[PDB]
Amino acid sequence: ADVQQKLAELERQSGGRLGVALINTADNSQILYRADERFAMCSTSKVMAAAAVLKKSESEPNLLNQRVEIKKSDLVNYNPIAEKHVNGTMSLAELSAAALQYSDNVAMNKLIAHVGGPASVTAFARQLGDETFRLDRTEPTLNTAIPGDPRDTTSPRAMAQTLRNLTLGKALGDSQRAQLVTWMKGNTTGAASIQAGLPASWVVGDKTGSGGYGTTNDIAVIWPKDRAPLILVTYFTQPQPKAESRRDVLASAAKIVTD
Numbered sequence: 001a002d003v004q005q006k007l008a009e010l011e012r013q014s015g016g017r018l019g020v021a022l023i024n025t026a027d028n029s030q031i032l033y034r035a036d037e038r039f040a041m042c043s044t045s046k047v048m049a050a051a052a053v054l055k056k057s058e059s060e061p062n063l064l065n066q067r068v069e070i071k072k073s074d075l076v077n078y079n080p081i082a083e084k085h086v087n088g089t090m091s092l093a094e095l096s097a098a099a100l101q102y103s104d105n106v107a108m109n110k111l112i113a114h115v116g117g118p119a120s121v122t123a124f125a126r127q128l129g130d131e132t133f134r135l136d137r138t139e140p141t142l143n144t145a146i147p148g149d150p151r152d153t154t155s156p157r158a159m160a161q162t163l164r165n166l167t168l169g170k171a172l173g174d175s176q177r178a179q180l181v182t183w184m185k186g187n188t189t190g191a192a193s194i195q196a197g198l199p200a201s202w203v204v205g206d207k208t209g210s211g212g213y214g215t216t217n218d219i220a221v222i223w224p225k226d227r228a229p230l231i232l233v234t235y236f237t238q239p240q241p242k243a244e245s246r247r248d249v250l251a252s253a254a255k256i257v258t259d
């Protein structure tokens with residue numbers, strides 16, 4: 001309860017809307033704040049697109065080696081890896097890694113297309129037991145994050161439970177689960193978000209997201225020193241369309257709920 005008051009104070013101080021879900025797998029306890037409200041996922045949705053391709057690879061073992069052409073027409077707004085491979089191909093494994101580790105938006109679009117579009121990613125979430133997740137659009141429009149707009153949203157509670165299934169549970173086969181976790185542990189974009197609020201010795205696998213209205217998100221699996229793992233989802237959005245990102249708010253929330 002003291003944690004609730006501290007999160008409420010942080011939310012007030014920040015001027016935005018904060019949603020937090022922590023799962024402590026030691027005792028299956030939860031810390032929740034606005035955990036059933038919807039938030040725009042932005043690039044945190046890349047985890048579900050990658051997982052859907054991994055699940056397909058359980059029945060098509062050569063799938064991650066399949067190659068995908070990258071053309072100038074594929075470029076969108078943020079393409080740090082794909083722009084180096086124009087007029088060549090990348091494998092689905094390389095695209096998955098680019099999406100998760102560099103937040104490459106071409107990679108995301110190629111993963112979406114492969115599995116059949118946003119409704120197919122959403123159908124995959126339903127098969128896992130997540131009835132809240134919805135992916136509606138492709139990159140870059142899925143990041144608009146308009147207040148009140150349900151498109152491309154989920155709730156903190158649902159995303160934490162689903163991330164627990166994907167990374168610590170049995171939603172994926174052992175090889176595929178290990179691959180997802182390795183990719184998330186190799187993320188290059190998260191050091192200023194949840195990880196900035198945790199001790200240096202803890203190990204984090206995370207995926208960040210940012211978008212309109214100053215939306216600043218991070219979802220993480222956390223291995224504390226000599227403890228059972230944690231799942232932590234921190235979603236944040238602001239009232240002003242051109243608000244700046246606030247990664248520090250996510251770091252502060254992480255420190256509060258892990259103290």
Ligand SMILES: [Cl-]
Nearest residue numbers: 240241242243
């Ligand atoms: Cl503004």
Ligand code: NA
Nearest residue numbers: 133154158159
């Ligand atoms: Na979700």
